[PDB]
Structures are given as C-alpha cells and as structure tokens.
Design a protein around this nucleic acid. Structure first.
Ligand SMILES: [Ca+2]
Ligand SMILES: [Ca+2]
Ligand SMILES: [Cl-]
Ligand SMILES: [Cl-]
Ligand SMILES: [Cl-]
Ligand code: NA
Ligand code: NA
Ligand code: NA
Ligand code: NA
Ligand code: NA
Length: 287
DNA sequence: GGGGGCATGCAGATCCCACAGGCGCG
DNA sequence: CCGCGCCTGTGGGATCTGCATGCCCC
C-alpha cells in the first residue's frame, strides 16, 4: 500500500527514535512482579502519520496520546513482539540500540519459555534489565543487590544502505536554511546530531557521503555530522535522499530545502527577486 | 483463583534539533 | 573587497526512557 514504509527505513527510524523497554515493577500479593516488554516510538503529533504508517506496515501496536502535543506507538502484547523481533532479526539496527534490542530479544525468550515464573527466574530478567538503557532503579537494586553488571558488547556496524540512512535522518537529522547579514547571504546546511556512544557510526557518514565534518565541542556528550559546502549539498546530499525517500515532516523540509538549492544553483539567489522567494520558502518551513 | 498478562494510560530525563556568531581563506 | 564555509557555541522541547494498576481470563 501507498502508506507502507521501506523496512530498512523503518529500522533507521527505529535507531533514531525507538526504545526497547523492560519494566519490572512490584505487584499486593507476596513478592510478585509486573513484567512488561515493550518497543516504543513517541513523536510530536504533527508526525502521527509516521506512527500510523509504521503500524500499518507491521500490523501490530497501539497508537496513544501523550499529553496534548505527543503521540506514541507502543508494541507490548506477546504475539505482537514476535513481529517486532522478526523484523529486527532481518533488518537489524546499527546504533548502540542494537544492544538494547538483543537484550530485549533475550528477555522475550526467557518469558516465552516461562522461565520468569520459576523460583529463580525473575533474577534473570533483572540481570537483563540492568544491561539495558539506564539500568536498574534504586528499588530493584535493593531487592537484587548482587546484580551489578551493566557490561554489554559495543555495537560496531556500518551504514547498511541509503534506505536506512533516510529513516535515521528522518528521525535525528535537520535540513535548514540560513540567512546571514554581513548583503543578505543564504546558506543551506545539513546536520545530524548524536550521542558520542556512536561516534564511529557518525564518523563513517563522511566516508559514506563523501563530504561533511564531525564537530564535538570543547565542553559534551553529543556530536554533529554536518555538511555546509553547497556543491556537496547539491551533488551528494540532495541525490542521496532523492533516491531514498524521507518520511514525516522532514520530507517536507527536504522538498522546501531543495527548492532553495535549485534557486542558488541557478545563481538566482543573488537576484533581489530570487532572494525574496527564499525568504518565503523559509518562512514556510517554520511550521 | 491466584496470579500472569493485557489495556491504557501517566511521569521523569536527556538527546537531540534548528539554529547563530566569529573569522580565515582563496 | 567579498562570499563561502570551517569552526565554535546552545536553548529547550521533542524525544527517549521509566512508572503505574485495574481488568480480563485461564
Ligand atoms: Ca536519536
Ligand atoms: Ca526527531
Ligand atoms: Cl507505553
Ligand atoms: Cl544511555
Ligand atoms: Cl540478589
Ligand atoms: Na506510550
Ligand atoms: Na542538528
Ligand atoms: Na563538492
Ligand atoms: Na523537522
Ligand atoms: Na541516553
């Protein structure tokens, strides 16, 4: 269907915005636990169509409101997780979140085998949870004080294809237009920010795209891959996402963005009339 | 028949996004 | 001189992540 999302683009978007959760909460009855596995993407409700298209591609998950500005797709039901696992086995994540998925998959197998009901089975879930995301809370640490290891292998993966990069960029990327006054100057920029735990992957964008720069700051837990040279934006960045379509509102930013690139390519941004259309397109992107 | 799991949420923490200014270089 | 773009810097909210529990069903 027209609303289907390329499975690599979906994995790339998951690498950007998704989250694998393992909730282990006290249940009342003596020493019983709620055990909840989940995959979640929460967005501004201006991008609810993304979540609906993902739900339509996978045929699992429930869309819910969060506040008045946000909306999330949550996959949680036991059989629904098998569809998540089957997709990610075949279209694997490449950021550090691969580690979280693999622990999530490991907890799933523990629960599918009913091992978390045996006398010494919840401790295994706690051990898995401690390695996921932000690890254990204080309460779980007090109830399982012997579970201290957060060691897990670091993920080292290459960008698999442009479909993945389109999904990743649709999440964590940015296409914007700069105007600077010395004459009013125009500048197209492309940037992706990311936590330094994936510094190798972000570094590799320079090779994979044949342009750009990695900036880190002298302060900083996150870095930026950025392209500021116009001919790199025109000859390398724009063709890559023409071949691999972005999703959500960022595709609209891109389409507006390229319209500015066409104007500047024709040198028609120097024209006072050409610059005035650039200001209009930019005012439209602010929406 | 107690719990395991679902349905359906709410709440906290931070990693992003969409930028701006200074300035050298060709 | 001039325009490009390398390089530094960042506010704050859209993300990422964690927390909650009554109901259903075997
Ligand atoms: Ca991200
Ligand atoms: Ca995003
Ligand atoms: Cl949820
Ligand atoms: Cl983290
Ligand atoms: Cl223990
Ligand atoms: Na949710
Ligand atoms: Na950015
Ligand atoms: Na170039
Ligand atoms: Na956007
Ligand atoms: Na984090």
């Amino acid at each position: 269907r027209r609303e289907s999302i390329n499975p690599w683009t979906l994995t790339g978007f998951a690498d950007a915005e998704g989250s694998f959760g393992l909730s282990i909460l006290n249940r009342r009855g003596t020493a019983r636990y709620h055990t909840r596995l989940s995959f979640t993407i929460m967005l501004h409700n201006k991008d609810k169509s993304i979540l609906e298209n993902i739900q339509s591609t996978w045929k699992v998950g429930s869309i819910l409101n969060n506040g008045d500005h946000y909306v999330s797709l949550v996959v949680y039901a036991f059989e629904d997780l098998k569809v998540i696992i089957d997709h990610f086995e075949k279209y694997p994540l490449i950021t550090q979140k691969l580690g979280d998925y693999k622990l999530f998959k490991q907890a799933f197998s523990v629960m599918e085998n009913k091992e978390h009901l045996k006398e010494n089975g919840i401790k295994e879930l706690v051990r898995i949870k401690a390695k996921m995301n932000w690890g254990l809370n204080d309460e779980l640490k007090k109830a399982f004080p012997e579970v201290i290891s957060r060691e897990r292998p670091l993920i080292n993966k290459n960008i698999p294809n442009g479909k993945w990069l389109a999904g990743f960029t649709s999440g964590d990327g940015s296409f914007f237009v700069r105007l600077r006054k010395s004459r009013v100057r125009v500048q197209l920029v492309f940037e992706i920010s990311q936590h330094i735990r994936d510094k190798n992957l972000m570094n590799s964008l320079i090779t994979y795209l044949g342009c750009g720069h990695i900036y880190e700051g002298n302060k900083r837990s996150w870095l930026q891959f950025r392209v500021e040279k116009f001919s790199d934006i025109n000859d390398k960045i724009i063709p890559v996402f023409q071949e691999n379509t972005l999703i959500g509102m960022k595709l609209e930013d891109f389409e507006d963005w390229c319209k500015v690139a066409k104007l500047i390519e024709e040198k028609k941004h120097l024209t006072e009339s050409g610059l005035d259309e650039i200001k209009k397109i930019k005012l439209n992107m602010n929406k």
